[PDB]
């Protein structure tokens, strides 16, 4: 995998595209990668596949893509290929186990339930914590972290009209931030490259580390 910083702007002066919706946003994220491979197995985490992090949404969007395919500049983008681009190996200095490395993990804590007049549904809420248990339970014995659970709202997603393109729903995303402790190198490595959680096309999953 490798890392790049990008900033997408609105096509015209009437916000016809792209920031108007989330489906076009991820559309602008897949368009940049023409060639795409996709290998699946019975319910593991997906590795196809891109990862991105939205920092701020007040200047059309500030975004950071970490992925495997090379990102290519398109219409109404930065004044260069980037903002910035470089390769990165989770092999550098091996990311020594037992050594501390900072991190920034997005998430979407959920628990699934049977709902009346359903057609079972998943629910973003799982008094005294439950999301700590949820993420450190999914967070198998690799780099353990801290759990910064929040208590607010909200994220929406609607369709621009294209077929086979998700419609309108909401989803909460918790922004955990801290200093990962590495207890397993290949497990945290493969877990970062895959992406942590479902809906990798909506921002969740991306993990970035740092040094002491």
């Amino acid at each position: 995998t490798w890392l790049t910083k990008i900033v997408p702007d609105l096509r015209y002066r009437q916000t016809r595209a792209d920031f108007r919706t989330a489906g076009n946003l991820h559309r602008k994220l897949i368009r940049l990668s023409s060639d795409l491979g996709e290998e699946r197995i019975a319910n593991p985490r997906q590795q196809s596949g891109l990862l991105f992090r939205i920092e701020e949404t007040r200047n059309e969007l500030y975004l950071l893509v970490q992925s495997h395919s090379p990102l290519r500049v398109d219409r109404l983008g930065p004044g260069y290929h980037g903002v910035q681009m470089r390769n990165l190996d989770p092999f550098l200095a091996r990311l020594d186990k037992g050594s501390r490395v900072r991190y920034r993990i997005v998430a979407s804590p959920t628990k699934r339930l049977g709902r009346s007049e359903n057609n079972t549904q998943r629910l973003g809420l799982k008094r005294g914590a439950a999301a700590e248990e949820w993420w450190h339970s999914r967070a198998a014995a690799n780099g353990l972290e801290l759990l910064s659970t929040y208590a607010q709202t909200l994220d929406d997603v609607r369709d621009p009209g294209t077929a086979d393109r998700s419609r309108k729903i909401r989803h909460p995303a918790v922004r955990f931030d801290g200093e990962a402790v590495i207890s397993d190198v290949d497990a945290v490595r493969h877990a970062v490259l895959n992406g942590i959680g479902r809906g990798k096309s909506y921002g969740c999953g991306l993990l970035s580390l740092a040094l002491i």
Partner: protein
């Protein structure tokens, strides 16, 4: 007349008090970020411990109307008689219109927009003063817009009822400047001694102005017990392990903090407890030889390796150190 307390305590990889977005609160000290625990949090844990042992229950709340109504319902009053009663107790106090209230709801009893801090016997006695005028309250409830009928003098004297937590931490009430008591214990924020951007070794400090504390409480034995339990609760409690270094000093001129000793962050890859200990020692020595004063100094340590000279005479344990220092005060 100032009981100063310093303590180095290593808090593990956790999140003591998160920020408004989940992250831990951080300072920018000496150029570097430093996770910190707000003073209001430790003050809350400490008081809850003090009141825990000394079961005074200095309840800090807004919904005083609901509890006054509860005491009146326990003592025979009807739901409407209790509710209207409590509202008479609150509306007959100050500034021409009683204590202001929040945007009332259609069914729930309102809550004062200002916030109160009282012990449980204070609420009980307030409900008692409300019960002595049953007929008056019922007569006022007959109207559409009632007014004050309660003897504001005695209820106002009940709101002035102090407590151990009220004495140490102080109270404020804008609509009742007669009950405002000033705190006697200066509690400082706890920042790490090394830049972290969660575990680490926090440094903590607090001052106890004996003079004002004896002034609020009045007696001197109650004051001595209150400060002793304060110190023990300050070391013992931890928000929702013991400090690796404890230094109590009694100063007769002015309180002093050792925070500047930890301005230049400490680099690691090694341990931080010994470095912080010997560096606090060094700063206490040079500061001691630059601001000469006749003070009392004592300290405890959970490691007998180093000898801290400037910190006084090394007592054996925390309760012994605290006992000898509160005694010497």
């Amino acid at each position: 007349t100032f009981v100063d307390i310093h303590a180095i305590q290593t808090l593990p990889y956790s999140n003591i008090n998160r920020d408004d977005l989940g992250s831990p609160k951080t300072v920018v000290y000496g150029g570097k970020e430093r996770t910190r625990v707000s003073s209001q949090s430790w003050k809350r844990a400490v008081r809850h411990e003090v009141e825990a042992r000394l079961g005074d229950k200095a309840v800090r709340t807004r919904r005083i109307i609901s509890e006054i109504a509860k005491r009146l319902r326990e003592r025979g009053w009807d739901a409407d008689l209790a509710d209207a009663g409590a509202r008479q107790v609150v509306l007959s106090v100050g500034k021409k219109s009683g204590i202001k209230l929040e945007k009332e709801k259609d069914s729930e009893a309102p809550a004062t927009s200002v916030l109160f801090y009282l012990p449980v016997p204070a609420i009980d006695e307030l409900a008692a003063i409300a019960d002595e005028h049953r007929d008056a309250v019922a007569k006022e409830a007959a109207k559409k817009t009632p007014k004050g009928i309660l003897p504001a003098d005695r209820i106002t004297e009940v709101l002035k009822s102090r407590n151990v937590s009220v004495n140490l931490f102080g109270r404020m009430l804008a609509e009742l400047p007669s009950t405002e008591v000033d705190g006697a214990v200066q509690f400082a924020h706890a920042f790490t001694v090394h830049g972290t951007t969660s575990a680490g070794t926090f440094y903590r400090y607090a001052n106890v102005n004996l003079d004002r504390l004896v002034e609020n409480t009045g007696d001197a034995q109650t004051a001595r017990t209150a400060v002793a339990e304060f110190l023990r609760a300050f070391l013992s409690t931890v928000p929702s392990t013991l400090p690796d270094l404890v230094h109590i000093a009694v100063r007769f001129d002015r309180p002093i903090s050792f925070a500047p000793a930890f301005e230049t962050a400490l680099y690691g890859s090694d341990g931080y407890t010994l470095r912080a200990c010997q560096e606090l020692n060094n700063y206490a020595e040079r500061l001691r030889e630059v601001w000469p004063d006749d003070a009392i100094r004592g300290y405890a340590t959970v490691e007998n390796k180093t000898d801290l000279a400037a910190l006084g005479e090394r007592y054996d344990s925390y309760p012994a150190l605290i006992d000898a220092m509160v005694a010497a005060a």
